[PDB]
């Protein structure tokens, strides 16, 4: 369970891992944890897979009903608030944790950590049990003002480093990049994963 988000000038980059693990026996090793909140707005699931999927559709609904009323995509801040208001409400019976990121025609690329039901604005956010060991790598490698390709470098390498140590994180990477033009998708295969020091 590893999710990642990085902010830059024109937009944000959101990575994810495909391993869905419960216990020591993998349940489903191939899955796409990216759940669209909207065409221009996405979220990153974490924690319990089943409980997180329900909040995604309950958020993608309330956001869609508000979207067509003004005929404009809601602000990224409005997306994090809906995720927070739903999370914090049921947070006692739901252990799911989410990561909200998106782009708008005003503010631009934004990332808001919803973890545990709080709200925070960060240039980069990590979550899950696999991200616990990447706190060291994210500090030295990250520098502001990186291009989307340079961001995907820092994004993929940090996730390719994550899934090695964590037992509950693995599989392939699903990337999403939202800019003024549109949405991009990149899938990094196990052999396509950048390989690090294994000794």
């Amino acid at each position: 369970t590893t999710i990642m988000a990085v902010e830059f000038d024109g937009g944000v980059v959101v990575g994810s891992d495909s391993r869905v693990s419960a216990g020591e026996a993998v349940v489903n090793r191939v899955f796409d944890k990216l759940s669209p909140l909207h065409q221009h707005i996405y979220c990153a699931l974490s924690g319990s897979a089943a409980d997180a999927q329900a909040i995604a559709d309950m958020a993608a609904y309330q956001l869609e009903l508000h979207g067509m009323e003004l005929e404009e995509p809601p602000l990224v801040l409005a997306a994090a608030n809906v995720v927070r208001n739903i999370t914090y409400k049921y947070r006692e019976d739901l252990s799911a944790h989410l990561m909200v990121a998106g782009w708008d025609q005003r503010e631009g690329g934004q990332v808001y950590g919803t973890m545990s039901g709080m709200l925070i604005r960060q240039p980069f956010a990590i979550g899950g049990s696999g991200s616990t060991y990447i706190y060291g790598y994210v500090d030295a490698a990250y520098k502001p003002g990186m291009s989307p390709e340079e961001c995907r470098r820092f994004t993929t390498n940090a996730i390719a480093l994550a899934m090695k140590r964590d037992g509950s994180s693995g599989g392939v990477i699903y990337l999403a990049t939202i800019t003024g033009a549109g949405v991009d998708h990149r899938v990094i295969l196990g052999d396509e994963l950048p390989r690090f020091y294994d000794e």
């Binding site: 973890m115 545990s116 925070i120 960060q122």
Partner: protein
């Protein structure tokens, strides 16, 4: 309920015509120090302010409720403002109902305020303990900075902004040493007759020379 974004010590002290409040910018998830940039202090109208400890998640929810309540009086234009007392009174009563419903918001909050030359400072607890003291601390700061404050308050009960903030600079300097969950970043919020003035992030110069004195 869960280990969610636990906070740190919260320090405050009265001075002449104002209140000094200081808190670290570090959020802490479990034993891990995770979020090193967060906003602990909120400005409430001109004369009042709030800062908290414990769960930062549950605070933002109650932090948001205050904002909507302040809007109610601002829309009226009645010519009045919320006093630090009433806010401290509403906060104690609002957090109280959380205990009777067996779903308490887990926090420790401090309210600074300035009313007609008399600066009010107050303390609350999750369980509803509330009182007024010229020096207030939270957590292990109550075991460290609190006796240091009361040592100076005996000789200097009346203080200005000069030595107050400068003493608070020395208060959090110890919080590096004997408080493991503290962090370098901190905020200094001062409430005066001109309203709340919140300075940006600051650091502290410390002396580690005790290390080289071991081999002696």
């Amino acid at each position: 309920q869960n280990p969610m974004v636990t906070g740190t010590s919260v320090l405050g002290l009265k001075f002449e015509g104002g209140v000094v409040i200081a808190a670290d910018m570090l959020g802490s998830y479990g034993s891990l120090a995770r979020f090193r940039n967060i906003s602990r202090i909120m400005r409430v109208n001109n004369s009042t302010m709030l800062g908290a400890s414990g769960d930062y998640a549950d605070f933002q929810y109650l932090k948001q409720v205050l904002g909507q309540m302040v809007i109610d009086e601002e829309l009226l234009g009645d010519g009045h403002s919320y006093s630090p007392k009433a806010i401290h009174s509403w906060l104690t009563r609002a957090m109280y109902s959380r205990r009777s419903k067996m779903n308490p918001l887990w926090n420790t909050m401090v309210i600074g305020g300035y009313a007609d030359g008399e600066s009010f400072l107050g303390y609350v607890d999750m369980l509803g303990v509330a009182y007024e003291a010229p020096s207030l601390a939270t957590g292990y700061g109550a075991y460290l900075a609190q006796p240091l404050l009361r040592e100076v308050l005996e000789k200097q009960p009346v203080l200005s902004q000069t030595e107050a903030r400068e003493l608070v600079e020395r208060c959090m300097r110890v919080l590096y040493y004997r408080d493991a969950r503290s962090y370098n970043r901190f905020q200094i919020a001062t409430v005066t007759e001109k309203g709340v003035e919140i300075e940006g992030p600051l650091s502290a110069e410390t002396n580690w020379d005790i290390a080289h004195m071991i081999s002696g």
